[PDB]
Subunit: 196 residues, 3 copies
């Protein structure tokens, strides 16, 4: 089966992905943005040296990279999880995170949403900073993060209404008793789904 | 007029549909799942014997059954109440009950959502389980039921944005003053709508 | 840039439209419903005399009016705000205010949703009625449905959806209106 895996930024989605790939050998885990960067660096070596250089491309060029990355991903034949985002926040508001072409090509069975308590997102973002993984203190409010998660749920349901796919919401909003518990719980739920 | 009538499983929607079917002239009340089962048995007598057997068909064959069933329904008569669901919960997540071909073929004027208080759904499911009517073993929490009702709301509005149809939300979340008041209230709001 | 601006009726959206048009010279602010009624009178003049007269028309005739109105608006050059409704409540339920052709023709960069505390909506409605009231729970429902419509259109049309939170308590009069006006100007002047 094929699932898109989503969640607000910096909340633990990467860790879930890495843990899934460590645990299940019957599974390929890919990060869409990384595949986009790699395919872009192949075609535009002069402009794209690091993942964030993707912002510099002209629209006609960026769109064709997303399509090409999706085609590359769709060559995978066993279980697949694609790490990406339901929406991005910009000054103009939220913008959908999947182009319809991406879904037409990958043909996901469903969308998985990791939903957190916004305080845990603020804290994870700051811990990632103290470990080096990001330069500036994130200043999103609990309110802004909740809004994002609500909007993401609506995007996922809309994509399901359009394309007929599962919408799997994984509740990680409860308090952790021990460290890594949210991540461990999500990984096991995804594995059990895949092996059902 | 033609309306798709929906709500979470086992909460009273079937009773509303049975009462509409007895009380309204010039109107057919029909259950999409029933037609699907009947068409499935017509075309696959070897595999389809119990209505659970639909689960064993390849998804492409199940979809073609859903098209055939919508075609049968649209031919029945002019005014229709189509009892079905916006989504059902599965091990892979919520999955839409309709396909686009359903709405294209039936051309509903709108979607009706019967919305219940989760505590009343829990009690009603257990009452019906004890009486031998409801046999959906898994017991859901209050928060599970509210999430389902929210997702159903999102599917219905998505379908309206795509197909320009009404979204009618019937609030049955207040406490009943006598047994079966919710059913009677919902029936009369629907009849009042159909004769406006 | 072009945005559709929406919110539940009677909550202050018109005031925001007026003050935007007044505080920004290079901006056109158009009310879709007004253009629709204009085109309706011009095509059905003996039948159409006030705006609620358009509910009498065959749906295909109404739709053609909606399309003609969108074409007229799509000619406006420079920044533009189109004041309209994601949905209205009817006896048959909520019904979308736009048709897909409206978005297709205007090609908005995005949708802007103004969101209010329900009791502030009730208050404003009375201050213009005195001159049947929905409950707080009705208005909340209407706002949640509008959000769902806007996100759906965003997914279908690949456009922005901006939510302007005006649910906090006003510390002085006019503060909600001023805040939304300024957030939208800030948006139109972004680089
Ligand atoms: Cl992460
Ligand atoms: Cl029932
Ligand atoms: Cl107003």
């Amino acid at each position: 089966m094929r699932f898109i895996l989503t969640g607000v930024p910096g909340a633990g989605k990467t860790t879930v992905c890495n843990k899934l790939a460590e645990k299940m050998s019957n599974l390929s885990v890919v990060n869409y943005g990384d595949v986009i960067f790699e395919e872009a660096k192949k075609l535009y070596p002069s402009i794209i040296q690091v993942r964030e250089d993707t912002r510099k491309l002209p629209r006609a060029d960026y769109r064709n990279i997303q399509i090409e990355a999706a085609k590359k991903i769709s060559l995978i034949t066993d279980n697949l999880i694609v790490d990406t985002h339901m929406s991005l926040k910009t000054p103009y508001g939220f913008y959908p995170g999947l182009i319809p072409e991406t879904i037409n090509i990958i043909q996901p069975d469903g969308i998985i949403l990791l939903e957190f308590n916004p305080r845990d997102v603020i804290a994870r973002r700051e811990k990632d900073r103290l470990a080096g993984k990001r330069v500036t203190r994130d200043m999103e409010s609990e309110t802004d993060i909740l809004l994002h998660q609500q909007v993401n749920r609506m995007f996922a349901v809309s994509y399901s209404a359009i394309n007929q796919c599962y919408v799997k919401i994984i509740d990680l909003t409860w308090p952790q008793e021990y460290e890594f518990q949210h991540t461990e719980y999500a990984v096991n739920k995804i594995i059990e789904m895949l092996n059902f």
